[PDB]
Structures are given as structure tokens and as C-alpha cells.
Design a protein around this ligand. Structure first.
Ligand code: HEC
Ligand code: HEC
Ligand code: HEC
Ligand SMILES: [Cu+2]
Ligand SMILES: [Cu+2]
Ligand SMILES: [Cu+2]
Ligand SMILES: [Cu+2]
Ligand SMILES: [Cu+2]
Ligand SMILES: [Cu+2]
Lengths: 454, 454, 454
């Protein structure tokens, strides 16, 4: 058999697991060991987006689940606990396991119970693990997946940073960015029509102040999973190249590629060398996923510019939209205040400020000045002030034809933005009304609901 | 030109074709030959699922079509017959053919006719063949695809077993497991929204008593096709690894991978070495295909357990659901009895028994005992007996909140199972009512139809 | 850094860009240069299909955009102009650029403006470029993508022909082949449900009289892009094989494959050697794309037949359908005449003639004779003449059961063809009525609209 390095030696090792986006240290070991792995399933509400709650099913309290790191030839004694608060039974199938179900039958664990099974890690490589409990698709869709690394006996080459990034497709009853606790939607899941496509279980999980970091000249290894359940990632780094891409434990290594297809349930190790400073975007290049459903993550490189290599500027809201900023905490706060019935004008203003970035600023500018004769101003806009209800219709349904704004004619097209939710339109317009010498007041979600219906 | 091994020598060879999942023997030949291939298109009803009929269009009476095996450098005289019972014209495009349409124009065959054309097999490799008749997508969707192997001149390395597995996506007017003769649905096909995703033309075609077999220590080669028409397979073996994956006649060979993307119209040769006994599941790891639409096949390995490699148990209904069992013949029988108007309580009981596995047993257990205080019993259930109509509502629409069953409180969540068809709910509940000291009687599909509508 | 060939030498080079499907000449240069690239965004209506207009956003007036060809180690001074007629701002992200956004922030260009940035081409390979302006998916969906080749320092091996082919998915409010100016459909785009899947921005862009050409014995290199935004191409050549497939600047080269997966945003260089004459079809082998949404392109090879390799005939309308013919200009003319209110019987006849190929002729024959007792005649058809309204119902809704046509019984199935638009049914039936001694007259789109509604 492969991984024939003899019986376990030394002492039993209690595996130290890490939460995304971090990785356990290299095993740094020349002998096979008995490794004891303890992983606990926890079902809990978390924010899938600002003001959007979801009942996740998690391995270790995170999506993706805790990272497991062992050595080819190790004997793994795998313990799965199911927290007493769980409503569902759970189990595990680890890719890389030699045996039926990858552990599934022997890891069946009711709420408040523990199971264990033992396997030899015969196969080096990076591998997806996931729940294997009927209905399997529901369990995986709710977040039950992670990565296990089985190192080659000599270890992977040294790098400056190792990170853990895992794509998933998610299925909410509500539409993208519709607030509240969103149930799982079985019909969307069966049709492979996700409402969100995410890295690490949430919109913005790896953007802004949650970005990954490295410095010019450093090497970065990323362990990239695709939990699915259903989508295949056109996995891509914007503005860079992968030195290496290696799938699972494959003998093949692709070098010097920017775009690479990761199967549903697949995993790859990618290597990046930082050359010039700025934000490098990991995306699913099935572009509506990346830019309309949340499938973007950032590796931010600090260090000296090299104008001979790249003369240009850091990413901004034109490309990254409302994820250019450190966070959108104001949207969470405004949503909470709406639930509590304490929503203030300033709550709306700060939420709208966050949402205006990219969505509106690409044309109207961050200062609302637009571009005379090309993009009309929102700053001190007579046309806006004259009819706040018209402004709701313009955001939802677009605007075209000749108009006059602050004494100048425009004859252009503002596309409809019907995908914005009632609260988003209300908060954006309240921000605009309370900025740039506009007349103040507020737009409510209910105001926008009425315009959308007629 | 490649395959330049000279003119055909020896005697003309009448190719012996095989039905899935079997493969013709190695050609075992050191000279190029004239190989005569005879393939007949037959249009006929077959069961795509238990009690679900479909009008398949087949090469050789099977989906996928008969397997063709020749040697690089052979001259192939290809004869296509279209059975007189056919309503449609048919033809063939074989991948690996050097020439326009891969044979399409010269193989146009009306019902009751025969065509022939000759090609040299210049290209070694495994290749999809399919019908190439307008509307091409309709012909392929109805099952008109198979594999042709063009061996390298020295032959493939010897293995213990060779099998033939081909994925397809299928488009029925009715939903998944809706009984009766299901028309092709053009609108679902254009939108790439299949109702079934299958190996070898049916649900359960390669599960249970139809599984592929090998023994511990043996090598298994699988010729894997993806007929499409539309889907790309995240092709995966649960609980194992592929020693090798080779696409078409590619120079590249990937080794030691578990998950591999097979394009629509693509084919690969995979190699497996049996290490420990049990069921190894071939899936499309776009998971809702595998677990909600039929895309699972089994390679069952017999032999001695090795607890040092894997301590765990064989697959069961928790993972495989209602395909853990040898077959679901009872569902076919009950459906037939419904059509004939002779449906008995015991017909329903046996159909429900088959469908209860995984679907209900994952939580309620195979004996209906559940888990006190966690999963309420269906065995001798006062709550079930008290209101059979409520039980229909619970299966369709779920149940949550505090309830009392057999003297114990539950406060958990049973998800809705609205995807079950009226007959499936009726048969499952009739099985439960006639098991475990429950009060007997029956639930009808019409009973369930009324609850679903209100 | 890679591409470390020193500072630019010689004179600054003004890059000569080419329109699809042509490629600039090899750079044929042994020193690194400063290359000045000028690319202008133009928003304009073009025909996405005959009689179907679309507002494309283009780099250089074409979809895909102008081809850029430079040498690894070059310093590229990139100038982006946005034509004054533009309504939207635009920018660029070139894959292969080392720097944040691949140029996006520094190339933001309002209508009537110009931007520039400088990058070193460190990375050899074929790369997608695309617009990177919020909403990014909308910009890409409207056609803003192309290819940049960064040659290795020694150049690519010499071939007889180099061509430029780029797949895209498109999202119209109307259905496939519904006439008129079709708006972008955001809801279809978010759901990844394209109405058209095309090579080079239109149906028939590379078919018939727009086919690519080469001769027997010649080598053809194709630079293949996938602009997306959303789809992954099961990229395939019908009746041939790729000698080589190389993705982006990857070290890996696959040889001797026919079917290859191109990620969304991906690019590959493929090599073909012409062996026998005829039409070789480039398709997305997700077959409904290729045969129902426009995803087919032709490389037509002229030269001597070799009956030892392939005895068969050139492609015809059975496989290629209504794209077997040089063009479908008659459909454009008839659509124009309908708009102008000058639609004649002969306008309809010529449009119907073009649309009858494959769609109807596969069964009824190009001469309408059918096959006695198998496919009933449309030529001098008593059954057709007897009830023109029935003929509309038959095309839309199909026909089955026993009928009598010209004295002979038929007992077969004509599938429904509801996907044909009202004008297409009207024009096809007007062609049939005015051919083969049929009674003449005409069917109007309004006639067909009424039958479809009842
Ligand atoms: C460029 C693609 C735009 C984006 C994104 C947004 N707007 Fe816009 N807007 C745009 C144009 C070209 C026009 C004029 C259309 C015409 O008929 O010529 C407008 C118009 C408005 C108006 C009314 C005029 C004014 O007060 O300046 C409002 C109130 C407005 N737009 C608001 C707005 C908001 C809030 C946006 C984000 C949700 C937004 N616009 C995006 C161009 C573009
Ligand atoms: C776990 C995910 C479950 C699956 C799968 C099925 N059931 Fe269930 N069921 C489950 C729970 C946790 C509960 C109690 C909910 C609560 O409010 O606490 C139930 C309840 C029932 C009942 C009513 C109570 C009883 O008689 O025990 C019935 C009749 C019932 N469930 C039937 C049933 C059938 C037939 C299933 C397969 C179609 C099925 N359940 C699946 C948990 C789960
Ligand atoms: C084969 C798959 C067919 C294609 C494609 C089309 N037609 Fe057809 N048609 C076909 C059959 C087998 C039948 C007879 C059905 C039966 O009940 O036996 C028909 C019938 C007609 C008729 C009526 C009979 C006649 O006049 O011959 C008409 C007017 C007709 N078909 C027209 C038609 C047109 C215009 C098509 C392209 C849009 C078309 N058919 C396609 C088989 C097939
Ligand atoms: Cu689970
Ligand atoms: Cu898996
Ligand atoms: Cu056919
Ligand atoms: Cu094909
Ligand atoms: Cu743009
Ligand atoms: Cu890109």
C-alpha cells in the first residue's frame, strides 16, 4: 500500500485544528504517528451577509470547518461529537480516506453523542471533508465542509504564509441581501441556483479589514477548497498569477496560470509570490458569482511600488464596489435598529453611505458631483429635491431621456437597479438626501415597497 | 499521419460490441485490420426510475449504447441501421474520427434503412460517440451516446476488470420520481435544468444488486463517458482514489486524484486498486445531482477487512439512502398495481418500506424507534395514530415546536419533504401505519394530493 | 522577477491591433520594447442574430475586442479611450498584468476621456482582458472582453494560419431569435441562463461564408478565449483533434485531445493539423448551447479527399441545421421589411427557405418529398392545402396519430417546435406554401400569434 512507513511511533499526538483562514503549523515530523482528531458539529445562526442571518451547520463553529493537518502514513483516530443543541444527526466523509463512505457509516452521531473511527492516511494531498448524512445536499449546503491536508513525508516547501479559503454555494428562500433570518431553500438547491456564492461562509469574510496579508517579496500558499454543494469554480486571482496549482494529491502540477477550474468537492494548493503592493482578488470568474453573489476574497500586499512593473493605483470601489471599504458594519446596525423599531435617520445615512460605494459612486462619484453633462450630480441636486418619490422610481426602474439637473441637460441612460432590496434603496436615498446640502428627511423601506408594487 | 501502421492485414474482423457495463475483450492484435462495426438504433420505452417510463432512443438497445473496441491504425467500416419501428431519422458522430461531422453526413439513416462509411482510426484514446441529427440536443437527451475505445498498438496494461460507465442528464416533463410515461421536456433541456442525472440510463442502474464487483488487491479500469447533453461531471469516487485519470487520447496522465472534471461529450479512463472491502460510490460531486437526481454508481469490493487502514463499517442508508438496498422493485410493482387499479395495502407497505430507507430512517431509525427526547418514534406512535391527516401534513410541510410522543416531549425540527410525490408519501405512511404495532389502514395518493393543495 | 530581459531598447512600437477573427503578425523581435497600445471603447447596436439588434459595449468596435500581441518582458503603455457617444464609464483588467485590478483603477475612463497606465509583461501566455467597471457582470455581458498574447521571447512555433475565436454568454429580455432591439436581462444574467451562447459576438459569425479557412496539410493555431461572463466551455472540435492545448501561460501542454474545459475568463492556444477536407465545427459541447443558442464556428479545409482516412461526405443541414448555408441574409431582409411595413410574400418565402434547412428538411427533405410512409411530403401536400391553420398548430404543437397525406397513411410523431418565434413559423409556412406546386398565399406572424395563444 502507499504511505507504507510502518506502525505509529513516538507519542500519540492530539491534533491542533485551526479556524479559517488560518492553517496549523507544518507537522515537522520524520516518523508516522497516531494522531487523535476531535471535531464537534455545532448548528448556529451566523450572519451570511450584513443583517442576513442563516442557520449554519458547522464543523468546529466555522464555515468552512476546522482545518486538519496530518502526515502521509499517520494513523488518524477521528472523533466526531454532535453538540447537544443540534437538531439533526451528522457524520463525516473525508476525501483521502481509504474505506467506504470516507468514514460515513462509523461516524453517525446523534445530537449529544460522540463517534470514532480509525483510518490510515495512505494518500498525500489536500482534500475536502463534508457531512454525509441524508439529505446530503442539505447538510453540505448548510456549511458542513472543510479541508484536511495530508503532508508528504518530507513536508511541503517552506513559504512565508499559509491560508485557508473555501468556496461554497448557498440557497436562501429570500433574494440576495434580503434581510432577516433566511431559511434554506431546497428548490433553489436542486436547481443549482444559489442566492450567495461565498468564500469562508459570509459576504466580506475575506475583504477589507478581514483581508489576508503578505509583503512584497513573500511567498503565500493557499489551501483552496470548493465545498459546493453544486458549483464548479473558475478560480482566479485578479492582477496576479499562480506560480503553482496542484489538485488534491495529484502527481501533476500546473505552473504559471491565473484561472483554474476547481470541481465541486475539489481542493487545490496554490502558490503566489508577491511582486507589487495592492489588493489581489480571489474570485469565481463566473463573474455574476464574484460581483453579484459575494464570491470575492482579498490578499492585500504591503510594500514598495515598482513603477517599472506597474504604474497604476490600488483597487477602489469602481471594481470592488461596496467591498472596497474596511467593512459595512453600518448595514448590520441599521438592520438591527429596524428590527428593534429604533431606526434613526443617521442609522440609515451610515448604512446608505456604505451601500453607495460602487453601486452609485461609479457614475455619480463618491462626492455626488457626477461629471457635468455626462453623469448628473446628486450633490445639491434640484432634480432630486423636486420629487423624492421620482428618486425611488429612478433607482428601481432606471431613467433615460433628456433631463435638466442644476441648469445642465443630460441625455443618457441610468440602468434599473431592481435587485436592490427596499431597505437598501431607502438607506441609499436617505444617505444622499442628508449629504451635499440636499434637503434631508428620509426614505423608508415601506416607501420603496409601495413604489416597487406600482 | 498518426496511426501509420500500413494497410489492413489478416481477415476482416466483425467487431463484437458489449452492453453496459461490460467491455469487449482487449483486441490482442499486432497488425492493423479492417473492422466491420454494425450498430442499430432502437427507440423504445424503458424505466428511467421505478414506475417512471421514458421513450429512449438507443444505440444497440441500451443507454449508453454498445461499447466499440478497435486498434489505432484500423480501418473501420461502420454500418448504422435504424430499426423499422423508429419514428425519427438518426446518424452518428464518433469522436476520434478524422473527417467532417465524425461520420454524420454519410450515416444519415431513415427508419428501416442502413448506411455505412469507412474511417481510419488515426487517434488512440477513449471517445464519446453520439447521434448528430437535428435537433441534436433532443437526440442526445433521449440517450443516443456511447463510447468507442481506440487502443494503442501495444494494448492497454492488463487489469483484473474493465467496466463501462456513462453519465447523462435527462429532461422529463414531470418532476423527479413522478410516475408514468414522462415526455422529453425541451424547455428544461434548453435551460440545462435536468430532472435526472444518471449513470447508464436509469436510477439504480449500478447500485445494489446491479453494482460493479471486484476483490481486495485487484485492479479495475473504468471507461467513463459523459454523454451530457449539457452537464459537466465533478466525477468522484467516495472513499477511494484514482491511481490514474487519462482523458480521451491525451498524452497527459493525472495520477492519485479523487475528483476530476469530465466535460460534456468528454471521456476518461480511470484506474482503481481495491485496498479494503466495501462499496465505493462513483458520483457527480455537484452533490444534488448525486443525492437528489440519481447520479450514483457502486463498485463493491469483497475481501478481508484491514483495521490498520480502515476500522469503519460498510456504507448504509444514512449516506446512500434508498439505494443502500439491493433494489426498489416494490415501487415498480406498486406503481403497476395503481395503473391496473389493483393496488393493495401490502403493495403500498412494500413500496413504502423501500422508500423509508434514508429518507425517514436517518432520524426515525430503520425500526421506527427514533432516539428518546431527540427523534420521536414512529413505532407504536400515539401522535401518528391520533391524526393520520396531520401525518401527511408533517411529511409534506415539516414539523417544529414542542410536541408529546409516547409520553415524552420533543422540541426539534423535521424539515419539509415536499419533493416527495403523492404516491411516495402515501406508500411511506402506509408502510409506517402497518408496522411496529401501528393501527394499520392506508394513505392514498389522492389523500396526499388534497393535503398538498391545501 | 520573470521576464527579466532588461530595459526597453530600440524605438517605441505602436501596437497594431486586429479585429476578430484575425491576429497581428508575430512580433519577430529579440529585444524588449516599449509598446504603446491604444484601445477605444465604443457602445453601439449590432446584429446578435438576423433581425435581432443588441446594444454591445465593445473594445475597438468588435466582440471580442481587438487582439493585442506583445513580447514577454515588454513595457506596455496602455491607453484606453472611451468614445464621446458612450453613456457608461469603462476601464480594463488585463489578465497577465502584475498589479491590482490588472489595470482597473488607473484605466477608469468617462465618456469622451482617455486614461493610461504602464505595466511590464512579466508573464508569457494567452490572456483574457475585460472591463472592470461596476456592475462588472453587465459590462462583460455586453461584450467588453478580448485577448492579449504575451509571446515567449523566442516566439511561438511557425504555423500556416492564426485565428482568434472567443466564446461569450449573452442575456436578452426576449427569447432566442425573437426579433427587434433586445435589452440586456439582468435576471437571466444573475441566474446564468443565457439566451445566446456565441463565438465572436453573433450567430453565424464564423459559419458559412464567414468560416475560417485552411488547406489539407496546413497547421492552424487558434487563440481561444472564454469571455463568459458565466459559462464554462466544453470546447470541442467535431471530426478532428487538437495536436496541443495550452492554457494561459501554463507550463503544462495537453496533446491529442478533442474536448477541453475552458474556465469563465480563461484562454487557451490550440493547434490543429488539416488532414482531410470539409467543415470542422468548434462548439461548446454542452450541446444545447452549440445547437440551440448559437455556439458553433467553422474551420473549412479545402484539398483532396483521402478515402483511406475518411470515405464520408461534407457536413450538411442534418447536423449544422440552418447554418450549413453561406448565410441567412433573407431573415435580416424580411425582419427589416416587417419593421418598414413593406413585407412581401417573396420576402417571407426567402426567409422561410433559409429557416427550413435542418429545422424541417431533416425529416421532410430539402425538396419537401419526405419518405413515403415514414415522413409525409410537404411537396404538393393535400393535407397542408386542406387547412393552413392546422399547419400552424402542427409546427407549434406537433402532430401524432394516423393521418393520410397524398393517398398514403402515416402513423408517426412530429415533435412540437414551440421555440420557433411567430415570424419564423409564418415565414417557414409561407416558403412551403409557395414551393412545390402548393397553393401559395401567406401566413403572417399575427396568424401564428393567435394560434399560439389558443
Ligand atoms: C451609471 C451607470 C449610473 C449608476 C451606477 C447610477 N446612476 Fe443615477 N443616473 C445616471 C445617469 C446617466 C442619469 C441621468 C439619466 C438621463 O435620463 O440622462 C442618472 C440620474 C439619477 C437621478 C436623477 C438626476 C439627478 O438628481 O442627478 C438620481 C436621483 C440618481 N441617478 C441616483 C442614483 C443612485 C442613488 C444610484 C445608486 C443606487 C445611481 N443613481 C446609480 C447614471 C448612473
Ligand atoms: C430528521 C432530519 C428527520 C427526518 C429525515 C424525518 N423526520 Fe419525522 N420528525 C423528526 C423530528 C425531529 C420530529 C419532531 C419535530 C418536533 O416538533 O419536535 C419528527 C416528527 C414526525 C412525526 C410526528 C411525531 C411522531 O409520530 O413521532 C411523524 C409522523 C414523522 N416525523 C414522520 C416522518 C416520515 C414518514 C419521514 C420520512 C418521509 C420523516 N419523518 C423524516 C425528524 C425527522
Ligand atoms: C421529423 C422529426 C420532423 C421534423 C423535424 C418536422 N416534421 Fe413535419 N411531420 C413529421 C411527421 C412524422 C409527420 C406526420 C405525423 C403523424 O401523425 O404521422 C409530420 C407532419 C407535418 C405536416 C402535416 C402533414 C403533411 O402535410 O405532410 C406539416 C404541414 C408538417 N409536418 C410541417 C413541418 C414543418 C414546416 C417543419 C419545420 C418547422 C416540420 N414539419 C418538421 C416529421 C417532422
Ligand atoms: Cu450533517
Ligand atoms: Cu465528497
Ligand atoms: Cu438520432
Ligand atoms: Cu460530439
Ligand atoms: Cu465597461
Ligand atoms: Cu478577469
Amino acid at each position: 500500500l502507499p504511505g507504507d512507513f510502518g506502525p505509529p511511533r513516538g507519542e500519540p499526538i492530539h491534533a491542533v485544528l485551526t479556524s479559517p483562514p488560518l492553517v496549523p503549523p507544518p507537522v515537522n515530523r520524520t516518523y508516522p504517528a497516531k494522531v487523535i482528531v476531535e471535531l464537534e458539529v455545532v448548528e448556529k445562526e451566523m450572519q451570511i451577509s450584513e443583517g442576513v442571518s442563516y442557520t449554519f451547520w458547522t464543523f468546529g463553529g466555522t464555515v468552512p470547518g476546522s482545518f486538519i493537518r496530518v502526515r502521509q502514513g499517520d494513523t488518524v483516530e477521528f472523533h466526531l461529537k454532535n453538540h447537544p443543541s443540534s437538531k439533526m444527526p451528522h457524520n463525516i466523509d473525508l476525501h483521502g480516506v481509504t474505506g467506504p463512505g470516507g468514514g460515513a457509516a462509523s461516524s453517525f452521531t446523534a445530537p449529544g453523542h460522540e463517534s470514532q473511527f480509525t483510518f490510515k492516511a495512505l494518500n498525500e494531498g489536500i482534500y475536502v471533508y463534508h457531512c454525509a448524512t441524508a439529505p446530503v445536499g442539505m447538510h453540505i449546503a448548510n456549511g458542513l465542509y472543510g479541508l484536511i491536508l495530508v503532508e508528504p513525508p518530507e513536508g511541503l516547501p517552506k513559504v512565508d504564509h499559509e491560508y485557508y479559503v473555501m468556496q461554497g454555494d448557498f440557497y436562501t428562500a429570500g433574494k440576495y441581501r434580503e434581510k432577516g433570518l433566511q431559511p434554506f431553500d431546497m428548490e433553489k438547491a436542486i436547481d443549482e441556483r444559489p442566492s450567495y456564492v461565498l468564500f469562508n461562509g459570509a459576504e466580506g469574510a475575506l475583504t477589507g479589514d478581514k483581508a489576508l496579508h503578505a509583503k512584497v517579496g513573500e511567498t503565500v500558499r493557499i489551501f483552496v477548497g470548493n465545498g459546493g454543494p453544486n458549483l464548479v469554480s473558475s478560480f482566479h486571482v485578479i492582477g496576479a498569477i499562480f506560480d503553482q496549482v496542484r489538485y488534491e494529491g495529484g502527481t501533476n502540477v500546473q505552473k504559471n496560470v491565473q484561472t483554474t477550474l476547481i470541481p465541486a468537492g475539489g481542493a487545490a494548493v496554490v502558490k503566489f509570490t508577491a511582486r507589487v503592493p495592492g489588493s489581489y482578488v480571489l474570485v469565481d470568474h463566473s463573474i455574476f458569482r464574484a460581483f453579484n453573489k459575494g464570491a470575492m476574497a482579498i490578499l492585500k500586499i504591503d510594500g514598495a511600488e515598482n513603477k517599472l512593473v506597474y504604474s497604476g493605483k490600488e483597487l477602489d470601489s469602481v471594481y470592488l464596489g461596496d467591498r472596497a471599504a474596511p467593512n459595512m458594519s453600518a448595514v448590520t446596525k441599521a438592520t438591527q435598529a429596524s428590527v428593534s423599531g429604533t431606526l434613526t435617520v443617521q442609522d440609515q445615512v451610515q448604512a446608505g453611505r456604505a451601500l453607495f460605494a460602487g453601486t452609485c459612486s461609479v457614475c455619480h462619484q463618491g462626492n455626488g458631483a457626477g461629471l457635468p453633462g455626462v453623469f448628473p450630480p446628486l450633490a445639491k441636486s434640484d432634480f432630486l429635491a423636486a420629487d423624492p418619490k421620482r428618486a425611488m422610481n429612478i433607482v428601481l426602474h432606471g431613467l433615460n431621456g433628456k433631463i435638466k439637473v442644476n441648469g445642465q441637460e443630460y441625455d443618457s441612460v441610468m440602468p434599473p437597479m431592481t435587485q436592490l432590496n427596499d431597505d437598501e434603496v431607502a438607506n441609499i436615498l436617505t444617505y444622499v438626501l442628508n449629504s451635499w446640502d440636499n434637503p434631508g428627511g428620509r426614505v423608508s423601506a415601506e416607501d420603496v415597497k409601495k413604489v416597487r408594487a406600482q
